[PDB]
Amino acid sequence: IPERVKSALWSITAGRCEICCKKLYISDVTGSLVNISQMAHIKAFSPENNPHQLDNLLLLCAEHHKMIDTDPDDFPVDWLIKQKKEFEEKVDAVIDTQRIKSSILSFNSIITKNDEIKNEEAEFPKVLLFNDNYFDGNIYRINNALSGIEHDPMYYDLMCQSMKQQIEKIKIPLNSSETISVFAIAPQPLLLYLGYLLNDETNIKIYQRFRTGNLKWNWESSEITNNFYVEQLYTDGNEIDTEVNLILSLSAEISLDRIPKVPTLILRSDRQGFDAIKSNEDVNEYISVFRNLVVEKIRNDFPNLKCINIFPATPVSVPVRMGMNYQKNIDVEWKIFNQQTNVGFIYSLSLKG
Amino acid sequence: IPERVKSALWSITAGRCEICCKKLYISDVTGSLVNISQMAHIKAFSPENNPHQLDNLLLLCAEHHKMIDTDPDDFPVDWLIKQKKEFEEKVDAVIDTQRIKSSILSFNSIITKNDEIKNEEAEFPKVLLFNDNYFDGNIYRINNALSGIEHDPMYYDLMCQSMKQQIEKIKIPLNSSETISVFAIAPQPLLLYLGYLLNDNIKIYQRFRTGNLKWNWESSEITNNFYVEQLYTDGNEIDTEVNLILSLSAEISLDRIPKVPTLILRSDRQGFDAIKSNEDVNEYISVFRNLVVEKIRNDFPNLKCINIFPATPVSVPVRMGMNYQKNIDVEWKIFNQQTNVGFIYSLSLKG
Ligand SMILES: [Zn+2]
Ligand SMILES: [Zn+2]
């Protein structure tokens, strides 16, 4: 008779007789009560910790409370425990259909003020709630420790190495995570490389940052809002060419006089601009058109393919999802370029085996 | 505010934050607590009679309590009610996979002492518990009000009608029952007629001699084979009547049968336990409807009558009367072995 364990047991049972499931917080003819403290009868099997102290007692209504202790013949503790477990496990099986634990991986090379990075990472658990997850306390940050080398030709190489090292330094907590929600925003080559480092570690949700709304990182639609298509800039394929230019024109339409002649394909979205991507479904459809209607088309049209030159103008989630889709030692080398200021499209980094 | 309603709310939620489902009766690092009185935070929208007093507040952990009121922008009360109803209704949907309500219909023309009839009907809700049901308070008894004319040539004629009236007198609560568990024991013609009166979630139970629960099943799986033996070379169209002999409890010898083509429906194991499970009864009814009645309807397109001579446990005639298809089947004349004289006509099933 300790009121704490009573409260816990009333909770595990949803306030019900563990045989007939009568609500013991409701009178048999009217409204409420002083409830399980009075109406309910706990049966103790045989004489603040809890290890199976909860797995000893069981709630009962009046009828079955008598019934089951005045016939220990038909109702052994053997059958009784079976009934207890088979009901409680059907109750707490609601986790299995509720929200799921999810860790958070954050990477922000664009926002520099530290008290603003914190200000903004304060919205991630809310987005997790809005996308059928909940924050399990583990947040992983990729260090922008090299903001000092931000314009040295070697920046990408070193930032890549840093990223790789950190990712591997948390690889075991990454593969063992229930779900990983990623909030990444950085130059498109580094986003691609982040997607490469991850590479479908079971359950990963890649989120997109918008300008508008209370939650910049939350989706703005839950359904497909764009068509993505391909336009090839070469009459038909051959077997001498080893390199192909692939131009992703989602955020803007990249004009060809910016591209350093080599066969080219252009992957467009119908609606171009800041909102080419509005839902996870948009990203899925983009990646489908990308792998099937673009990359595989390139591998077919060019069996002697040795390199793809990627020129992107895409929102943040798209390079990460492209870097996740890479098939190591089955795909070719992917050289990703980045528009440096004034200079045009300049090489940034590469994906290999 | 009052722990009066708090206990009910802790119950509807299974002791959990209605967003993240953290168990609020367990510490984040160790064992138990003083639990939801301390660890939990109820959010009230605005200020022991519960009609939606329960549908106002909601449980929260620390994190999400601090989170959801310091952000009424993303978290309006509309979204909160949506989450609350979804989770709460997702919780109490476990009855839908628990026990099922079941009413009780009792009929005992064999046991006569009144303090023994009640003594024995005190065991029915226990059988309901052991067969995935629970008693919903409604017990229906078919009255053996004619115990005094039990041997008058017309007894059956009257008893049937009595039963019929009683059935109609509760016909409306019978169609509306979640489940109806039947504990019937009487001469096989009356059991057949009871099954006919029912004709429909109905669980027909069998009484055994041995065990703590005479009426509970003794197996949950098939324990017998039922087969047919025909005593006529092939069918014709001149015959209008057929003798059907059900030899489950014993092997009815034919010199007791009042010549007419005959089929015999036997079980491998005959005796008091030819039927041991509901599955045995299902298999019997399958062999009966398909391998017997339809066989006769084929072999005899000018069929006009089936003569039933039974030796079956109590559940079998009731289930046969349940399986009767009115105005598709023919007349079923059911006989009962009366003392010395052999099988004497008892009653009939028609349209
Ligand atoms: Zn109960
Ligand atoms: Zn919570």
Numbering used by the authors:
A (entry chain B): 16 to 62, 71 to 283, 291 to 383
B (entry chain A): 16 to 62, 71 to 223, 226 to 283, 291 to 383
The study reports:
Here, we present the biochemical and structural characterization of two CBASS systems, composed of CdnG and Cap5, from Asticcacaulis sp. and Lactococcus lactis. We show that CdnG from Asticcacaulis sp. synthesizes 3′,2′-cGAMP in vitro, and 3′,2′-cGAMP is the biological signaling molecule that activates Cap5 for DNA degradation. Each monomer of Cap5 is composed of the N-terminal HNH domain, the C-terminal SAVED domain, and a short flexible linker connecting these two domains.
The overall structures of LlCap5 and AsCap5 are very different. Therefore, the structure of LlCap5 can be described as in open configuration. Therefore, it is reasonable to conclude that the configuration of LlCap5 shown in Fig. 3a is enzymatically inactive.
